């Protein structure tokens, strides 16, 4: 199912509740194009070979992407994917791309508004995760950089403005089994832009690893040190990391472990300090399994194993 | 309920409503005569709207906020025009306006009179014997704006020029929610969490009537000359009293009741209905935020009514290109046969040592194993002697059985090829006397016709065969 | 776009005796189990209420079988001499057993060790004993004393009614399901009488003459009855008091007849009649008692029986032969953490707003020939056509479709002798068939006109052509004699 | 190859050729994605959207060798499904009309040309239409009365059209052909699909009668027989796709066409029967069985004429009493109860054998009193209660060598409420008969009492019928449908 | 009593008379991808791309100018060569349509409502050789025309400008080439490429391809099919 809610403090009502038949929903993200600002697609996928795109009032427009124009042999499924912008840089045209994981190292990229196979990037080892960093170049131009991360600890930085070329590598210090990378501080997936000029380069980079560890790096010195040292090595969780998400302004880092109940930790930045007053022992979380921030209002939505989503508010914002 | 506050324009053509959206209150105006994507967000998350009044030369509304200042907002330009700032860090608990004069009660029990055309606070004012105040009106005394009514669980008629409380009706227990002057000297008070609208008489200082709803009264509206009072009720209903100002006579129940229920069975609550003379308007929330409206005639509508709406409750997604199963629209449907019957145009329908007694026994009781074991033989003298000493009609059904056996196993027809010859030879004249030859040997004629059809192409095959055979024999 | 159309199987024109759905149902009656008894089994009858069981008479013995197991469930052996009839009640609890001492023994099912009632009829042995259908507590017996006796359970020592009016050897009697008072009775003189139990009785209301000895009478409908006796059997109607039809299609004397109605079958009403040959035959009163099906068991059958309409499971048909043979022809019919991590898939969308599905169902799996003709591997499709394990009609279909879609030259281009020879093996199997000969002629003509001299260089293929010439001259003679027989048919018309 | 269209990036090439396939080439890894079944070959492909969102493509529909039948298609690039399909009605003409030119392929076939063959075939078609007089172009068109639905017997297909909104609502294959199961290549183009030559309904509207002919491949042993197949179908008013119920191979035996088909009216069996007529003169009356869901050969009159002429037709008396049979130089009247000639005991010379001058094309009764016959040289209007001739008009100076047999039958029709309406065709010529045609539609009544109205049309008209709203429907050479009505 | 009237039309008016261009899909999407516009042999139909049905019909017989121009009962010569979304006259009006037929007509009309029965009719100058194609970048329009003098057709490229007067359609006469066998235009509308037989005269191979830019002179390159082809072919 997909459930779109209108969100408030007193009434969090249903706006729409679609039910796909015979297709589980592992991930589902909104998307709005930066050129048009009126597209409002919703992408969703599970452990199948099809990716449903619902356009955005009583009949649903659900297209689905299922065909790979080059190769259906790189990936078994679509269950992990991300959405990004991309500028063509010959024509000043921006459009959405869809990043997908494959079998061994294959990252597949699909032009999203039409389902085209655009480009492909293969890391060595097994992919465990990836993320989408932005770099503004001039007034009216940027370039997107795909940051992919192996299991063992390497990190590859490709650019997607021109076709897939590795800009650089560097290995995470330590980090045997990495689960999730996530950049933050600027415009990214959890805090998207509304025009071209609002795109800002992300500041921090977190790497979360199944020994409960999180290494936190600063981009301004990793990019020049080329085998960097983490600004911090947080360790307050004892099971695998399943959600690393920054604030929409780059001040808080939430890390959530799916394995044990009440496994959420908030870390103030740049002071790299775990918040002490929250969450407590008597804080209702359950087995935390999805985290989300508001783009502006400082709301924090946390969904657990028992189907409940709960909703806090940071009163500073 | 998601809608925090709402208010109609006079004549009931637009309604404005302020609702929270991501902890920032946004106001929006919708026409209700048959969207307006425009809004007005609040810049701060802490300041909120408290009172919301319509004003009719550019039409506008007036927002008494938590800030302590009154925001005059022009709806057509979609910009807050003016901020009448009061000299306190408090909250406007009630607003009111008539013409150019404006009045407000602030939470410090403070009256303020403003002029719009002067854009200026005329007078700050405070009064004794009013500890809390949260509703106010000014009486429709024509142009004279004197002797206004204030209310917080105890209504006080208080003058402006005399600036002191004059009359004090006993109010309610809870704070006053609605306070509306219908006519001269008659006005409604309705508390919070109450079911009793007191229609009070001013100059007597007394109670004319009480009007009883079925549950807690959310919102009140009244027509031009008190002939209709419609109140929306907090469980979601519309109770209308028709002529409540005429003569067990102290309390008056609701005259008509209007619910709104969807087509599936779920009930849609109501908020802020408005009623004109012989014309009523209802508003509800279609989606989580979207306001939908309806117009109806409450005189022809019966005493109990449920307006039905078609909400897409368990709707299936029909699409234009996709056919109801599997294929698309432009997919030209192919050709399948299924279990359809094939029939040729030659199968007609609706048109000594003998074996004689065993043949006749099988034909009297058509045993297929016995027929097989009695057709296994091939001795021509026995064949001739059988169909000599057989019955004619039994030989006819024997020919039919011969035909079906040949058609079932064409490999069997070898020794069975002379059997039909002997049947025709020894019982030809009975087949001259029978009237329906085609009807009785359609299957024989079909098999024999098929063989004669296979003949000539087979002979062409034979010519090609012995051609190449003698060709490779000589070379 | 559109989908790939499935392969259209070539359906021949209808052969004589096309397979009816009735024939399909009676051939879905499969799985004939054969059970031995010691002597000639006499009477079989099913249990009405829960139809999972049926009783059968045998040598001094009454045996109750189940249906789902087809096994000897109950054995009644309290008798002295051989039993004569076994009949259940409408309540499915009591069976009555007519013995050969002139005392009937009626007692409950599923408890052989109690003789609940021992009713004494005439001193002559009793032949038939039957419960009422509409009535729960009245019984009717008939003995060799040529007197039928109606008994109530309250009077075990005296018959409630003593019905007479017969000539010789009363051996069948039955009730009408419409009237709970009228009873039909067939003696050895034909001449089935129709009596009434609410009147005096000893003189019939009316009779209808079956000249040969009638051995069975069955009220098939509320208005029609069947006299099953002698070689033929006459189906009468009581309201018109006259034989509606009669069928004499039986070889020997008909020994049993039953009826079943309103059950899960293409044919609504079925009438079975067994006639002392193993020959049981199924008609239907809806088609004026027309021949629909027949089974044949070798030994002369004595009794047949069919499971009732409310069988709620596997249907049954049994034919005890005179050697003591039962024919049972049966138409048959991860942990908690893993579930809590995948426990949402059973939702199926009953409550949400908008339902949407673009799914495609799983079609029939394609075979090798269909896959190869789809992928245009045409010579390989020809080889998969001439694999040995392949049906004749199926090879005919793929031959037709290859010839229709593509051309046989591209079908036969890169051939050698080892792949020519299975084609010609299929030819020597199937030129003799009426349906395929023109197609096979096309194929052998194009392969000879291609492979003229390779025929010379390969020696055994020459011998294939020789025996092909021999058999095709056989078909020459067959078809010419066929045109001759057509000419003499034209003479005789 | 027919279409080459680059994407806006220049990394993808859409190609389209003679096989009904659209190939998206990804030029980097030189891979491709396919669209393999489109109901026709594709002439053009194009990308539309600013981000490349829609694929527009123009299809040729070359199965109709006479009429180059186009189709406009628009696809989402997302799911590659038919987002929009636009097509007009697709008639089946007896010849190519004005400028219809077979597209470029390697081999000159029955459906394609070479290049030297392109110029030669263009010159040949122009000289054919200038020289010859056999310009018929008479297409079979049927009307379903229970929905007033226009039915077009396309080559091995049916196009269900509705002229009220001017849209094709359906396209359905009926023969076991290779139209959609497979594309066609350079040497397979000489193979042709089965031709569904005859298609009508019963007056019940629930039974669809069809007759097609099968063409075995060339250069074979059995390349000579034309296998004649008849079929009966059924559709509901809540459905739009007909389902076959009865198949029939070789009616009246092998290799004999069943060219003339006439349904039954509701008066005799609630319109559940048909009458099939050959060049041999045999009349087979089939009827839908009650207990069996199929149809059966209920009645048959079987002569065996040594001669053959397909100029055959039959008409049916409105009560089902008698059957007119128009044969070459002969008019027959057949009793229905015994399939014998109309034996009258009074012998008032209302005989069942009438001599005529030429091959009869049409015989149509307007009621139980008036019969109009159109033979290959003239028309004659006669009575039925009395065997007395009323009217006669010449067809020789216009219908000289224009048609073959049966084309006048598929042309002229008769309404039960206003009378008969016929057609004539001429051409304007400037010093050579010029290509531009000019037809006339004439309305009569009551065995040609008077001309109710003559109306000339400035271009060709190939088919005329009457919709059951009592209004007559005519076609053009272009797919334009017009109506005359009250 | 009995009146005649054409009701339904079929065939799309595809530019078969061109027969050289590989971009013959003349039907165009609007600015907003909402409705698709096809000129048939007898009418112009506009379909909403979501509900897939014909939301607007523009019958030549129902119109007066379209009847007198396109429904000529003597010659089928004039067929629509192109639709254009924006108005040629006014800068950024929305629901306009400019129509160019086989012979230089500029018909400015309106969909999305009721078609006024007085559309803005214009005629281009220099309508002696036949109109083949037209397109535009911003502002400037280019027009291709088939000109005739060996059964081949020369192409004259002009630039069409307007807004001096209402009739004044200024022709700039950009360039010309001869005996083109196969010509095509990029999807941007800025480049075309064509062939000739002048190199068949001057050489052994029968054609050479020349690509030419339209609004600029950046790409003007000729090269032979002898250079393109291979020895195996």
DSSP per position, D220-267:
SSS-S--EEEEEEEE--SS--S-EEEEEEESTTSTT---BEEEE--HH
Q: Comparing C-alpha atoms, which of A207, A217, A204, A275 is closest to residue A241?
A: A207
Chain B nearest-CA residue for E53: B320
**Residue of A59, A62, A299 with shortest CB distance to B22:** A299
Residue D384 three-state SS: coil
B320 contact E CB<8A: yes
Q: What does the CA dihedral D335, D336, D337, D340 come to, rounded to 10 degrees? A: 40
Question: Which residues 55-74 on chain A approach chain B with CB closer than 8 angstroms?
Answer: 57-62
CA distance C392 to E105: 69
Report CA-CA distances (Å) from C88 to A170, B388, C39, C56, C270.
Answer: 90, 53, 22, 11, 21
With contact defined as beta carbons under 8 Å apart, do B102 and B113 qualify? yes
Q: Which of D382, D271, D274 is nearest to D333 (CA)?
A: D382
Task: Record the tokens describing residue D459, joined without a space.
Answer: 């271009």
DSSP label at residue B259? E
* CA dihedral (D301, D305, D308, D309) positive or negative: negative
**Does the CB of E74 have a partner CB in chain B at under 8 Å?**
no
The resolution, in angstroms to one decimal, equals: 3.8
Contact A19, B314 (CB under 8 A): no
CA distance to partner chain B, nearest, from residue C161 (Å): 42
Q: Which residue's structure tokens are 């199944």? A: A210
* Residue partners of D161: CB distance under 8 A and separation at least 6: D89, D149, D150, D151, D152, D167, D168, D169, E8
Inter-axis angle of helices C378-385 and C417-430, nearest 10: 50
Do E and B make contact, counting contact as 3+ CB pairs within 8 angstroms? yes
Give the span between the Cα atoms of C382 and C368, in whole angstroms.
Answer: 10
How many beta-carbon pairs below 8 A join chains B and E?
Answer: 5
Q: Which residue of B has its CA nearest to C471?
A: B462
Q: Which of D79, D85, D161 is most worth mutating to test chain B (most B CB atoms within 10 A of its CB)?
A: D85
A113 to chain D, any CB pair closer than 8 A? The answer is yes
Residue B91 to residue B89: CA distance in whole angstroms: 7
Contacts of C413 (CB under 8 A, 6+ apart): C379
Contact status, residue C83 vs residue C60, Cβ threshold 8 Å: yes
Q: How far is D73 from chain B (nearest CA, A)?
A: 9
Distance CA A98, CA A51 (A): 10
- Of the candidates D163, D478, D485, the beta carbon closest to that of E2 is on D485
Among chain E residues, CA nearest to B318: E51
- Smallest CA-to-CA distance from D365 within D425, D312, D412 is with D412
Q: Give, in order, the Cα–Cα distances in Å from E163 to each of B247, B259, D11, D456.
A: 79, 63, 40, 46
* DSSP label at residue B328: B
Distance CA D229, CA D247 (A): 7
* Residue among A17, A21, A64 whose CB faces C353 most closely: A17
CA D386 to each of CA C108, D325, D368: distance values in angstroms, whole numbers, following the listed order: 86, 18, 11
Establish if C441 touches chain B: CB-CB under 8 angstroms.
yes
Any idea of the CA torsion for C482, C486, C487, C491, to the nearest 10 degrees? 140
Reading across the β-sheet that carries B165-170, which strands appear in turn? B135-137, B148-151, B154-158, B165-170
Q: Which residue has the tokens 């709806």?
A: B75
Q: Which of D243, D285, D289 is nearest to D264 (CA)?
A: D285
Determined by: cryo-EM
| Number of neighbouring beta carbons within 10 Å of residue A60 | 22
Q: Measured in whole angstroms, how far is the alpha carbon of residue D304 from the centre of its chain? A: 28
Alpha carbons A18 and A42: distance in angstroms, whole number: 12
Distance of CA B359 to the CA centre of its chain: 75
Report yes or no: A307 at the B interface, CB cutoff 8 Å.
no
| DSSP summary character for residue C287 | G
CB C395 within 8 Å of CB C384: no
> Chains that contact A by 3+ CB pairs under 8 Å?
B, C, D
Residues 6 or more apart whose CB falls under 8 angstroms from that of C362 comprise none
Q: Is A92 on the interface with D (CB under 8 A)?
A: no
b/e per residue C372-409 (b: at least 16 CB within 10 A): bbeeeebeebbbbbbeeebeeeebbbbbbbbbbbbbbe
Please give the span between the terminal C-alpha atoms of chain C, in angstroms, as a whole number: 57
Q: What is the CA radius of gyration of chain B?
A: 50
Question: Which residues in chain B have Cβ-Cβ distances shorter than 8 Å to A294?
Answer: 22
Nearest residue in B to A297, CA atom? B22
Task: Inspect the interface and report whether the beta carbons of D249 and B449 lie closer than 8 Å.
Answer: no
| CB-based contact B204:B188 (threshold 8 Å) | no
> Could you say which DSSP state residue B446 is in?
H
Partners of residue D180 in chain C, C-beta under 8 Å:
2, 5
Measure Cα distances from B141 to B148, B183, B201, B299 in Å: 10, 10, 15, 31
Residue B9 per-residue DSSP state = P
Q: Best residue in B318, B320, B330, B331 to probe E by mutation, most E CBs within 10 Å?
A: B320
Element (H, E) at B443: helix B442-474
Chain centroid offset of residue C58 CA: 24
Contacts of C6 in chain B (CB under 8 A): 336
CB contact under 8 A, D88 and E40: yes
Report the SS3 class of residue E86.
coil
Classify each residue of A230-251 as buried b or exposed e, where b means 16 or more C-beta atoms within 10 Å of its C-beta: bbbebeebeebbbbbbbbbebb
Alpha carbons C167 and C189: distance in angstroms, whole number: 7
Q: Measuring CA to CA, which residue among C5, C8, C3, C12 is closest to residue C392?
A: C12
Angstrom distance (rounded) from CA D46 to CA B12:
53
How far is it, in rounded angstroms, from Cα B136 to Cα B142? Answer: 17
Residue C411 has which token pair? 């079908």
Q: Which residues on chain B are in Cβ contact (under 8 Å) with D246?
A: 340-341, 343
How many CB atoms lie under 10 A from the CB of residue C306? 24
Interchain proximity E50–B320, CB inside 8 Å: yes
Which chain D residue has its CA at the smallest distance from E9's CA? Answer: D480
Return phi, psi of residue D2, to 5°: -120, -35
Question: Do the Cβ atoms of C349 and A19 come within 8 Å?
Answer: yes
For the beta carbon of residue A72, count every other beta carbon within 10 angstroms: 11
Query: Residue A99 — left, alpha, or beta (φ > 0 → left; ψ -120 to 50 → alpha)?
Result: beta
Instruction: List Cα–Cα distances, D78 to A51, D1, E48, in angstroms.
Output: 11, 25, 19
CB contact under 8 A, D298 and B341: no
Rounded-to-integer distance, Cα B242 and Cα B206, Å? 22
Which residue, among A96, D11, D50, A117, has the nearest Cα to E187 in the 3D structure? D50
Three-state DSSP state, A64: strand
Is E51 part of the contact surface with chain B (CB cutoff 8 Å)?
yes
D182 near B CB under 8 A: no
Q: Which of D37, D181, D217 sits opposite C407 (nearest CB)?
A: D217
CA A65 – CA A110 distance, rounded (Å):
9
**The tokens 């790299």 sit on which residue?**
A272
User: What does residue D411 show for φ and ψ, rounded to 5 degrees?
Assistant: -85, -70
Among B324, B325, B330, B452, the strongest candidate for a mutation testing the D interface, having the largest count of D CBs within 10 A, is B330
Secondary structure class of C285 (helix, strand, coil): helix
Mutate to test the interface with B, among E48, E51, E52 (most CBs of B within 10 A): E52
Residue D62's closest CA among D45, D42, D44? D42
Distance CA B331, CA D173 (A): 11
The answer for residues whose C-beta is within 8 angstroms of residue D163's C-beta and 6 or more apart is D150, D473, D481, E7, E8
């Amino acid at each position: 199912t997909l459930r779109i809610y209108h969100i408030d403090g007193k009434t969090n009502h249903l706006v729409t509740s679609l039910h796909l038949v015979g297709s589980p929903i592992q991930t589902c993200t909104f998307y709005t194009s930066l050129s048009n600002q009126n597209q409002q697609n919703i992408f969703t996928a599970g452990r199948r070979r099809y990716m449903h795109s619902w356009d955005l009032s009583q009949t649903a427009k659900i297209e689905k992407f299922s065909r790979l124009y080059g190769h259906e042999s790189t990936q078994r499924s679509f269950e992990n994917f991300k959405v990004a912008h991309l500028q063509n840089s010959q024509t000043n045209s921006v459009h959405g791309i869809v990043l997908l994981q494959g079998n061994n190292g294959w990252i597949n990229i699909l032009h999203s508004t039409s389902g085209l196979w655009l480009m492909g990037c293969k890391i060595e080892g097994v992919i465990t995760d990836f993320c989408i960093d932005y770099q503004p170049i001039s007034r009216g131009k940027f370039r997107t950089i795909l940051i992919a991360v192996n299991a063992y600890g390497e990190v590859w930085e490709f650019d997607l403005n021109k076709n897939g070329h590795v800009i650089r590598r560097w290995k995470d210090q330590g980090g045997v089994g990495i689960t999730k990378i996530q950049v933050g501080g600027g415009t990214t997936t959890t805090c998207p832009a509304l025009q071209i000029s609002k795109i800002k380069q992300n500041r921090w980079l977190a790497v979360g690893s199944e020994s409960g560890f999180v290494n936190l790096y600063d981009r301004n010195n990793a990019m020049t040190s080329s085998t960097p040292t983490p600004v911090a090595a947080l360790d307050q969780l004892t099971t695998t990391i399943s959600n690393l998400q920054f604030s929409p302004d780059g001040q808080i880092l939430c890390m959530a472990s799916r394995a044990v109940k009440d496994a959420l930790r908030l870390v103030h930045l740049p002071s790299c300090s775990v918040f002490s007053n929250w969450p407590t022992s008597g804080t209702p979380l359950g087995k935390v399994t999805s985290v989300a921030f508001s783009p502006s209002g400082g709301l924090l939505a946390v969904g657990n194993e028992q189907g409940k989503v709960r909703l806090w508010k940071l009163n500073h914002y | 309920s998601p809608v925090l506050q709402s208010a109609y324009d006079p004549s009931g053509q637009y309604l404005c409503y302020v609702t929270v959206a991501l902890d920032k209150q946004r106001v929006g105006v919708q026409p209700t005569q048959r969207w307006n994507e425009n809004f007005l967000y609040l810049e701060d998350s802490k300041l909120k709207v408290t009172c919301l009044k319509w004003v009719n030369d550019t039409v506008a509304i007036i927002l008494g906020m938590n800030n302590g200042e009154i925001w005059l907002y022009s709806v057509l330009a979609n910009e807050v025009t003016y901020k009448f700032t009061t000299g306190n860090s408090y909250e406007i608990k009630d607003i009111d306006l008539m013409g150019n004069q404006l009045w407000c009660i602030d939470s410090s029990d403070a009256f303020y009179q403003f002029d719009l055309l002067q854009f200026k606070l005329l007078q700050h004012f405070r009064i004794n014997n009013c500890v809390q105040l949260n509703k106010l009106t000014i009486v429709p005394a024509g142009d004279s704006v004197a002797q206004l009514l204030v209310a917080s669980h105890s209504i006080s008629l208080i003058d402006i020029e005399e600036k002191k409380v004059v009359m004090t009706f006993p109010g309610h227990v809870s704070p006053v929610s609605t306070l509306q002057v219908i006519t001269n000297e008659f006005f409604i008070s309705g508390a919070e969490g109450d079911r009793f609208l007191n229609v009070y008489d001013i100059h007597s200082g007394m109670t004319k009537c009480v009007l009883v709803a079925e549950s807690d009264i959310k919102e009140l509206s009244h027509s031009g000359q008190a002939d209709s009072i419609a109140v929306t009720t907090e469980d979601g209903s519309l109770e209308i009293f028709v002529d409540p100002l005429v003569s067990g006579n102290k309390s008056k129940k609701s005259s008509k009741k209007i619910q709104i229920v969807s087509k599936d069975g779920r009930k849609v609550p109501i908020y802020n209905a408005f009623i004109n003379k012989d014309l009523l308007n209802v508003s509800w929330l279609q989606n989580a935020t979207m306001p939908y409206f309806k117009n109806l005639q409450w005189r022809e509508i019966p005493n109990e009514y449920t307006v039905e709406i078609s909400l897409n409750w368990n709707n299936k997604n029909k699409s234009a290109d996709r056919d109801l199963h599997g294929k698309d629209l432009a997919s030209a449907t192919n050709y399948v046969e299924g279990n359809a019957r094939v029939t040729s145009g030659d199968n007609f329908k609706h048109v000594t040592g003998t074996v004689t007694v065993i043949l006749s026994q099988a034909l009297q009781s058509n045993d297929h194993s016995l027929l097989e074991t009695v057709l296994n033989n091939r001795d021509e003298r026995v064949i001739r002697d059988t169909i000599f000493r057989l019955k004619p009609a039994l030989a006819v059904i024997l020919l039919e059985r011969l035909a079906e056996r040949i058609a079932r196993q064409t490999h069997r027809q070898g020794p069975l090829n002379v059997w039909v010859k002997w049947c025709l030879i020894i019982h030809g004249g009975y087949l001259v006397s029978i009237p329906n030859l085609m009807s009785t040997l359609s299957s024989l004629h079909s098999t024999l016709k098929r063989r004669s059809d296979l003949l000539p192409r087979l002979l062409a095959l034979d010519a090609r065969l012995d051609c190449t055979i003698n060709k490779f024999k000589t070379l | 776009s559109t989908a790939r159309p499935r392969i259209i199987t070539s359906k021949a024109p209808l052969l004589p005796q096309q397979t009816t759905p009735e024939q399909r149902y009676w051939r879905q009656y499969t799985s004939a189990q054969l059970v031995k008894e010691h002597n000639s089994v006499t009477h079989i009858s099913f249990n009405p209420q829960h139809p999972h069981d049926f009783a059968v008479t045998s040598s001094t013995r009454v045996q109750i079988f189940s249906s789902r197991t087809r096994q000897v469930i109950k054995t009644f052996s309290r008798f002295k001499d051989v039993v004569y009839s076994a009949s259940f009640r409408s309540d499915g609890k009591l069976l009555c057993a007519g013995d050969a001492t002139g005392l009937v023994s009626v007692y409950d099912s599923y408890n052989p060790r109690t003789i609940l009632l021992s009713i004494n009829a005439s001193t002559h042995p009793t032949h038939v004993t039957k419960f009422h259908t509409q009535d729960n507590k009245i019984l009717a017996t008939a003995s060799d004393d040529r007197v039928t006796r109606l008994w109530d359970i309250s009077n075990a020592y005296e018959p409630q009614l003593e019905l007479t009016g017969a000539t010789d050897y009363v051996r069948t009697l039955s009730f009408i399901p419409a009237a709970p008072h009228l009873v039909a009775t067939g003696s050895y003189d034909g001449l089935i009488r129709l009596y009434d139990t609410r009147s005096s009785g000893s003189t019939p209301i009316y009779s209808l003459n079956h000249d040969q000895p009638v051995e069975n009478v069955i009220a098939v409908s509320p208005t029609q009855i069947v006299s099953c006796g002698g070689n033929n059997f006459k189906v009468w109607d009581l309201t018109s008091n006259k034989k509606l039809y009669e069928r004499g299609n039986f070889n020997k004397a008909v020994t049993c007849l039953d009826y079943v109605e309103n059950f899960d079958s293409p044919m609504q009403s079925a009438l079975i009649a067994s006639s002392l040959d193993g020959h049981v035959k199924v008609f239907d009163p809806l088609d004026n008692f027309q021949v629909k099906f027949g089974w044949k068991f070798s030994g002369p059958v004595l009794s047949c029986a069919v499971s009732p309409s409310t069988a709620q499971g596997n249907r049954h048909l049994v034919a005890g032969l005179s050697s003591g043979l039962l024919a049972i022809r049966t138409k048959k019919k991860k942990s908690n953490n893993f579930q809590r991590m995948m426990r949402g898939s059973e939702y199926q969308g009953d409550q949400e707003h908008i339902i949407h599905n673009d799914k495609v169902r799983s079609q029939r799996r394609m075979r090798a020939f269909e896959r190869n003709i789809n992928q245009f591997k045409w010579s390989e499709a020809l080889d998969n056509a001439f694999v040995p394990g392949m049906a004749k009609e199926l090879t005919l279909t793929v031959l037709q479709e290859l010839r229709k879609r593509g051309k046989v030259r591209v079908a036969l281009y890169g051939r050698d002798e080892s792949t020519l020879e299975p084609l010609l093996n299929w030819c020597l199997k199937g030129i003799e068939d009426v349906r395929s000969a023109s197609i096979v002629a096309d194929w052998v003509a194009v392969v000879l006109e291609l492979y003229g001299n390779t025929l010379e260089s390969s020696p055994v293929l020459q011998e294939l052509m020789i025996d092909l010439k021999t058999k095709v001259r056989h078909e020459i003679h067959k078809s010419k004699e066929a045109q001759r027989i057509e000419g003499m048919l034209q003479l005789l018309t | 190859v027919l279409s080459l269209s680059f994407s806006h990036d220049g990394s993808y090439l859409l190609s389209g050729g003679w096989e009904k396939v659209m190939s998206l080439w990804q030029l980097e890894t030189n891979s491709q994605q396919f669209l393999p079944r489109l109901n026709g070959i594709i002439i053009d492909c194009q990308v539309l959207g600013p981000q490349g969102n829609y694929y527009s493509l123009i299809l040729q529909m070359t199965e109709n060798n006479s009429n180059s039948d186009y189709q406009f298609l628009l696809l989402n690039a997302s799911d590659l499904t038919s987002k929009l399909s636009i097509n007009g009605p697709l008639p089946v003409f007896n010849s190519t009309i004005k400028h219809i030119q077979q597209p470029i392929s390697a081999m000159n076939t029955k459906n394609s040309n070479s290049i030297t063959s392109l110029n030669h075939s263009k010159k040949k078609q122009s000289r054919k239409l200038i020289k010859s007089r056999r310009q018929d172009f008479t297409t079979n068109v049927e009307i379903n009365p229970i929905n007033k639905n226009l039915y077009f017997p396309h080559i091995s297909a049916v196009q269900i059209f509705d002229f009220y909104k001017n849209e094709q609502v359906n396209y359905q294959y009926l023969t076991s052909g290779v139209n959609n199961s497979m594309g066609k290549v350079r040497f397979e183009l000489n193979l042709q699909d089965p031709i569904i030559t005859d298609l009508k309904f019963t007056k019940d509207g629930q039974w669809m009668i069809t007759y097609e002919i099968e063409y075995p491949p060339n250069d074979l042993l059995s390349s000579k027989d034309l296998t004649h197949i008849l079929k009966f179908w059924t559709k509901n008013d809540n459905e739009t796709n007909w389902n076959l119920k009865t198949k029939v191979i070789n009616p009246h035996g092998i290799s004999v066409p069943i060219t003339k088909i006439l349904p039954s009216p509701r008066s005799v069996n609630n319109s559940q029967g048909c009458l099939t007529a050959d060049n041999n003169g045999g009349l087979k009356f089939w009827s839908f069985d009650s207990h069996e869901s199929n149809w059966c050969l209920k009645k048959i009159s079987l002569p065996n004429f040594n001669h053959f002429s397909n100029s055959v037709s039959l008409a049916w008396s409105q009560d089902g009493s008698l059957i007119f049979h128009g044969f070459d130089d002969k008019l027959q009247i057949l009793d229905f109860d015994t399939f014998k000639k109309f034996e009258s005991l009074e012998n008032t010379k209302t005989v069942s054998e009438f001599t005529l001058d030429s091959e009869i094309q049409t015989v149509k009764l307007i009621n139980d009193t008036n019969l109009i016959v159109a033979t290959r040289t003239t028309l004659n209007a006669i009575n039925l209660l009395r065997g007395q001739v009323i009217n006669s008009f010449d067809l020789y100076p216009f219908v000289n060598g224009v048609y073959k047999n049966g084309h006048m039958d598929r042309l002229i029709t008769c309404d039960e409420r206003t009378g008969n309406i016929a057609l004539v065709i001429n051409q304007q010529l400037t010093d050579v008969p010029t290509i531009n045609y000019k037809s006339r539609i004439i309305i009569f009544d009551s065995d040609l009492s008077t001309k109710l109205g003559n109306f000339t049309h400035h271009e060709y008209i190939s088919w005329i019928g009457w919709n059951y709203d009592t209004d007559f429907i005519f076609l053009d050479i272009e797919s334009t449908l017009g109506v005359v009505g009250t | 009593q009995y009146k005649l009237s054409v009701v339904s039309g079929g065939k799309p008016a595809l530019n078969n008379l061109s027969s050289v261009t590989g971009n013959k899909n003349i039907a165009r999407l609007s600015q907003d991808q909402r409705n698709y516009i096809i000129p048939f042999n007898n009418q112009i139909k506009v379909y909403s791309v979501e509900t897939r049905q014909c939301v607007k019909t523009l019958k030549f017989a129902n119109n007066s100018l379209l009847s007198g121009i396109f429904l000529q009962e003597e010659e089928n010569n004039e067929s629509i060569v192109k639709i254009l979304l924006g108005d040629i006259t006014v800068p950024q009006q929305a629901h306009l349509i400019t129509v160019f037929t086989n012979n230089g007509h500029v018909i400015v009309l309106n969909y999305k409502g009721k078609l006024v029965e007085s559309p803005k009719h214009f005629k281009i100058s220099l309508a002696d050789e036949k109109l083949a194609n037209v397109f535009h970048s911003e502002g400037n329009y280019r027009i291709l025309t088939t000109f005739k003098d060996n059964s081949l057709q020369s192409y004259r490229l002009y630039a069409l400008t307007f807004d001096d007067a209402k009739k004044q359609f200024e022709v700039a006469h950009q360039a010309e080439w001869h005996n083109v066998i196969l010509s095509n235009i990029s999807s941007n509308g800025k480049l075309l490429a064509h062939m000739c037989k002048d190199v068949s005269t001057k050489d052994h191979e029968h054609k050479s391809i020349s690509v030419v830019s339209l609004f600029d002179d950046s790409v003007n390159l000729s090269f032979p099919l002898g250079s393109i082809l291979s020895s195996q072919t």
